[PDB]
Amino acid sequence: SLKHSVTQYLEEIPQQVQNRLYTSPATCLAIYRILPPLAKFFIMAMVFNENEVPLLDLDKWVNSNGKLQFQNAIKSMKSLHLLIPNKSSGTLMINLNPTFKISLRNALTGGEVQNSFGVVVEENVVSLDLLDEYSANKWETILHFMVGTPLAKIPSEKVLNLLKHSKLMEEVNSTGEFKITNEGFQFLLQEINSQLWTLLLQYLKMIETMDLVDVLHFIFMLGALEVGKAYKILSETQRIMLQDMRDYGLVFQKHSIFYPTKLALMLTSDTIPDGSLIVETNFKIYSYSNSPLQIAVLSLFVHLKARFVNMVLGQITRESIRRALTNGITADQIIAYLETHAHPQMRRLAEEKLEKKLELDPNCKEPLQVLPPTVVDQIRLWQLELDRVITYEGSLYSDFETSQEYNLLSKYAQDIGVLLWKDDKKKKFFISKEGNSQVLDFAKR
């Protein structure tokens, strides 16, 4: 939902603020990268002719088989205020955002970029030895800090405050310690560009006027940037948060020349295997992977034995399972990790068993779990045996009369999100004590 989250945020961004974002070619290039294929095709077609089109021509062009996907593309196109659809001459006359159009055109032609792709110094050096090494160092420090295994190099105070305020890896002030939230484990499960995008979305949400569009344009060009060169130190708000993301280890800055590491490239785009684990009914771990980070994250939910070159061995204990459970870490998160860490031989065996059971019966009279339930459902049985109850606390309305209070005001209560529970035949439904915003108002009628 990364593109969904960013698109949602930009839809939250108003129309003229969006148009301000559509001014510069680097921002337009990054946003074009965000757009789905259909809308990407539409804008690359229309960008080289100043002919507005009606919707009817596009509809006649569009094959109706993917019409839902077309609707999604144009819904994003309109809701981002990237389109100006007006019903001119009775027809919904389709118009791209013109600033976006011309900035995309200049980016494609290599025309006027105003160094939106970057105020270049072009003093290239080696990046694998300084930039990549410092980047790996700083990211290792922040990563083990997020893990909770002890490490001396604490992060910045800005990100420390952002973690304190945010629900990510809770620095619980009563305990004085960063603590793994379920959101923290979601961040741990996240892909690296997902983690970066969540971090920048949270930082953009917390940061206020520091010009928001300056941060937006700078973020987009920073994603647009390339590795291993010096560049001019631009807006000053951009410069100071550039120093901030220098302290994050994103850029290797020599206090004016700065050298962006590979993290900008991964932020822009992604780039018996490694990370593939053989499950065991004896809960033994046969990982085809090793890192001290791997051991650090496996310490949270796996009882391990020793570290060898790719062979990380161990045995999953129920103590490890319940250690994961008691942190608020979801068993769905656990199986997210597990099903992202499967192995070729065992998944081939699972697919062979699935194709064997397909011909016998469609249901098979077996629980729906594709990963082999000899080991996988043992956690899933422990997953179901973990939660296994439903608790309702607070207020409760009871002993109703007839279903005019259910199909008219409790069926409507599904549309507004105020009930915690719904039982028509019991003539009772449960709400939270604090969730009495619009519950004791229309139920009286």
Binding site: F48, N49, K60, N63, G110
Partner: protein, 417 residues
């Protein structure tokens, strides 16, 4: 045998047989001959491979096998009889067939008969079981014991034949008729019982040998050489293929139903290399939005045309009345049958085919008029609401039919006129 075109056309019973097998074949044949009165020989003349396939499917038969060996004795016993295996027993043992046919249609029942048969010692004798006086057998079935014995004698008499001297062990043992040595061992000679009589293992072994001989002479039914026999192929020349290679002479005709100069292309080449080293601008590629608008018009026109092509991407769903749909499909089918037979007559090319061609031409004309009258029916049934679609659906076969009529008329004017 039953393999000629005449034989396959003659077998009316087989024709009725696969008729009754199919259902659309009653539909087609009924319309063809019951309704249209086509010569049914010419009806079946197309379906000759189908007729022969049906005949050969019905015609095969299995090979012999040791049905008594496959019989198992299986507390109590329940008869689980298979009629094909019962007839297999009948064919393998005409004595058992005779014992069935003189007792069951005269005295008692079939399952009772087979219970008596399984009880009988004659069954044990015919199977691989040594007879025993402790066994009582069935008296009714075991009355046939001496009859089966004289059957065995007659069959052995039939099975006797002269032997090749190349393998004749009788000639081998008749090498020296005055061999005077010692009496051979009891161990290696055929042993007997205490009272000098045999146990009968020689009888059961010669019996199973008789079974083998009977099987191989059943194979040897209606349905010098030692030079070839003693060839030593291992020291002979290897066989080499006489397959012919093929070459290919290559001389193809040019495609049937201003010239540039080296100086001018060299001048242009020099100029364009000059332009190439001179300059190259990506930004000038942007068009003038007017000729580009004509490009938009051309592209969109192509999209509209090919989209209308793609708009018409079990048969198709139709809003026809189902009875009229079936009737028009039937008429289309019989018209296609008529057309194919008319083409068969026409492409045959004989003066003997002339009256056939004329009569099928008349039938095609009749089909045309019946199509028109059907069009009148859907005319006054729809007010041409979808009678137009009816006419268009029946159109192309009508066009091909009337094209064939024009071809027939043209060739009539070519030859006669």
């Amino acid at each position: 045998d039953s393999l000629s075109k005449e034989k396959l056309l003659t077998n009316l019973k087989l024709q009725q047989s696969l008729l009754k097998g199919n259902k659309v074949l009653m539909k087609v044949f009924q319309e063809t001959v019951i309704n249209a009165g086509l010569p049914p020989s010419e009806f079946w003349s197309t379906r000759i491979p189908l007729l022969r396939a049906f005949a050969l499917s019905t015609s095969q038969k299995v090979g012999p096998y040791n049905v008594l060996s496959t019989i198992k004795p299986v507390n109590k016993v329940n008869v689980n009889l298979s009629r094909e295996k019962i007839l297999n027993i009948f064919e393998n043992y005409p004595i058992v067939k005779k014992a069935y046919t003189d007792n069951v249609p005269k005295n008692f029942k079939e399952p009772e008969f087979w219970a008596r048969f399984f009880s009988s010692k004659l069954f044990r004798k015919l199977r691989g079981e040594k007879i025993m006086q402790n066994d009582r057998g069935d008296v009714i079935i075991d009355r046939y014991l001496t009859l089966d014995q004289e059957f065995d004698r007659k069959d052995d008499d039939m099975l006797l034949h002269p032997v090749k001297k190349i393998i004749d062990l009788d000639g081998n043992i008749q090498d020296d008729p005055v061999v005077r040595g010692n009496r051979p061992d009891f161990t290696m000679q055929p042993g007997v019982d205490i009272n000098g009589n045999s146990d009968g293992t020689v009888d059961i072994l010669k019996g199973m040998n008789r079974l083998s001989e009977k099987m191989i002479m059943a194979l040897k039914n209606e349905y010098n050489d030692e030079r070839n026999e003693l060839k030593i192929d291992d020291l002979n020349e290897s066989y080499k293929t006489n397959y012919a290679i093929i070459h290919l002479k290559r001389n193809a005709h040019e495609k049937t139903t201003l010239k540039v100069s080296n100086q001018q292309m060299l001048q242009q080449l020099s100029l364009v290399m000059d332009n190439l080293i001179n300059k190259l601008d990506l930004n000038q590629v942007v068009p003038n939005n007017e000729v580009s608008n004509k490009i938009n018009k051309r592209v969109i026109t192509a999209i509209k045309i090919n989209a209308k092509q793609a708009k018409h991407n079990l048969e198709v769903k139709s809003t026809l009345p189902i009875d009229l749909l079936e009737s028009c499909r039937m008429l289309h089918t019989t018209c296609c049958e008529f057309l194919k037979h008319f083409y068969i007559h026409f492409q045959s090319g004989e003066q003997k085919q002339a009256s056939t061609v004329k009569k099928l031409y008349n039938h095609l004309k009749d089909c045309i008029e019946k199509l028109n009258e059907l069009f009148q029916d859907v005319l006054n049934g729809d007010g041409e609401s979808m009678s137009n679609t009816c006419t268009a659906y029946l159109k192309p076969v009508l066009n091909s039919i009337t094209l064939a009529t024009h071809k027939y008329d043209e060739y009539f004017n070519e030859y006669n006129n």
